[PDB]
Swiss-Prot record, chains A, B:
Transmembrane segments: none
Pfam short name (any one): DHquinase_I
Enzymatic class: lyase
PANTHER family: 3-DEHYDROQUINATE DEHYDRATASE
Pathway this chain belongs to: Metabolic intermediate biosynthesis; chorismate biosynthesis; chorismate from D-erythrose 4-phosphate and phosphoenolpyruvate: step 3/7
Family to which the UniProt record says this protein belongs: Belongs to the type-I 3-dehydroquinase family.
Keywords: Amino-acid biosynthesis, Aromatic amino acid biosynthesis, Lyase, Schiff base
Protein name: 3-dehydroquinate dehydratase
Keyword GTP-binding: no
GO molecular function, one term: 3-dehydroquinate dehydratase activity
InterPro entries cross-referenced by the UniProt entry: 3-dehydroquinate_DH_AS, Aldolase_TIM, DHquinase_I, Type-I_3-dehydroquinase
Binding site for 3-dehydroquinate: 19, 44-46, 80, 211, 230, 234
UniProt keyword Metal-binding, yes or no: no
Amino acid sequence: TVTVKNLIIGEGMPKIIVSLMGRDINSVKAEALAYREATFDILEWRVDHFMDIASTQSVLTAARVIRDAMPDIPLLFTFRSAKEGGEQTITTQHYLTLNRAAIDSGLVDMIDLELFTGDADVKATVDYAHAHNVYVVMSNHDFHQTPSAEEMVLRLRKMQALGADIPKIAVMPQSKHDVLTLLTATLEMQQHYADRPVITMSMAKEGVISRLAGEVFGSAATFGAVKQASAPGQIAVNDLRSVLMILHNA
Amino acid sequence: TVTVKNLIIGEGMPKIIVSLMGRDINSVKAEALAYREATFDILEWRVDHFMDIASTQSVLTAARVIRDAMPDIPLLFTFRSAKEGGEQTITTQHYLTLNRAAIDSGLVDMIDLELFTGDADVKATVDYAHAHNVYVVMSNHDFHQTPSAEEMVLRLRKMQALGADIPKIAVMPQSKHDVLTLLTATLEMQQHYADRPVITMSMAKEGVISRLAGEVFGSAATFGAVKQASAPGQIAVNDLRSVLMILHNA
Ligand SMILES: *C[C@@]1(O)C[C@@](O)(C(=O)O)C[C@@H](O)[C@@H]1O
Ligand SMILES: *C[C@@]1(O)C[C@@](O)(C(=O)O)C[C@@H](O)[C@@H]1O
Ligand SMILES: [Cl-]
Ligand SMILES: [Cl-]
Ligand SMILES: [Cl-]
Ligand SMILES: [Cl-]
Ligand code: NA
Ligand code: NA
Ligand code: NA
Ligand code: NA
C-alpha cells in the first residue's frame, strides 16, 4: 500500500481524485477555495492548464497557493503533456525541472511522471522524488484507442520495474469490448503481476463503469469532477462517492 | 423490445425486479402491501417459497391477492426449482400445471420457465403462454459455479431458439475472473447473437458489479432487495436505482 499524507492507497474503497484546473494564479486560488468545499481524497493540480508555465517560480507560487488553501490534502502535481492529452507543449528539460522543483519544494506529496518521457530521465526523476519522500504516479494515456490487454499489462509492469509507486493508465474505448479489455488488464495486473497499487480507467461515456468498479477488479483510485471534468467520462464527485460506498458495503 | 404491462424491457436503464417471498396467504398479502411502498419495475412472485403449493387453487388465490394489491405492476410468476436454487421440490407435471394455470388466469404478465425442464415441455409451455398473451422469461441458474462464456452464450442462444421472450442466466462466481466471464458472455450475446432482451447476473458479493452494469454490457433487468434478498448479491432497491440512474445519465 502507499500511505501518502495519511491516506492508505490500495486498501478499502478506491480513492477519489479531482483535478484542479486554473489558467492563472488568481483562478488557481479561486478553484482551490471552491474545491475545499467538496469531499474527495486526493487533489491533482493539472499544471498544464496554467498559462505561465515558462516561469518555475510562477508554477511554485501557484502550488503554494493550493497548499495554503488545503494544508492537509494529498497533493498530486501533474503536468500532462500535449502528447498524452494535455493543454500545451513543453520541452522535456522544462517538464523535468518543473517536477524536480515541485519535489524539492516540500509542497507536494506526489508527482505524475509520464512513462514515455524516456527511461533514463524517468529513473533520474523517480530517484529524486524518493530522495525527498515524494511518491510517483507513473502514467500513460491513450486518448484515441485501447491497446491490447497484453500491451497494457506489460506497460504497467514496466512502470513497476522503473520504480513507480503507483502505475497509472487511462485509455479511450472505441467499443464496449475495449472497456472489457481495460477491466481484464486491470484484473490480470492486480492478480498476477502487481506488487503495489495500480490505477486504471477507460475514458468517455462508454468507460464509466471502469471508474466505478475499482474495488472488484483492482484499480486503487478513480477521478471525479467537482464542476468540470478534466477528462471525458468523469462524473460528479458526490455521485462517484455514493456508488463507491454502495459497492464497498454490498 | 418486450413491452410488458407498459414497461419497455430492452430500452433505457435496466429494469428493477424485486422478489416477493411469502410462506402462506397471509404473509403474501402482507408482503405485497409492503412492496407497494417501494419503487421498482417488475414484481416477481417466488412461488417456491409458498408452503401450500400442492393446491393449484391455493397458488392462484395467492396470485390474486398480489394482483389485487398491485393492479398495474408487471407481474412475473416464478417457481424456482430446488434443482436451480429454490426452496422445495415439485414434480415436473405439477410445475408445468402451476405455470399453465397462472398463464390462463389472466393474473400474471410473465412466467419464468427453466430451460432445463426439457425441450418438449418447454415448447408446449411457451406456446401456451403466447396463446394467452403471456411472456416467458426462460431461465437458468448455477448456484455453484460459472460456466465458460462459450457455454453461457450457447445456453442463451438455445433459449431464443425455444421461443423465450427474455432469456435469463444467473451464475455463481468462484473468482473475480468468473465475474468478468459473465460480463463477457453478456456483451457477446448482446452484440453478436441476441435478437431480443437478455437478463444476466453474476451472484454473490463478488458479482455485484454485474447487477449494476446492465446498460453498458447488455443485461435488460436486474434484481434488488426490498428488505431481504431472494439470492446472494442483491442490494437494497433504492441504492440500485441510484446507481442505475447515475450510469444512465453519465
Ligand atoms: C491520470 C489522468 O490522466 C487521467 C484522466 O485523464 C482521466 O481520464 O480521469 C484525468 C487527468 O487529469 C489525469 O491526470
Ligand atoms: C432470476 C432469478 O433466479 C435470479 C436471482 O437468483 C438473482 O440472483 O437475483 C433471484 C431469483 O428470485 C430470480 O428468480
Ligand atoms: Cl486540507
Ligand atoms: Cl488471471
Ligand atoms: Cl400497482
Ligand atoms: Cl464481440
Ligand atoms: Na534539481
Ligand atoms: Na513484473
Ligand atoms: Na392447461
Ligand atoms: Na443464435
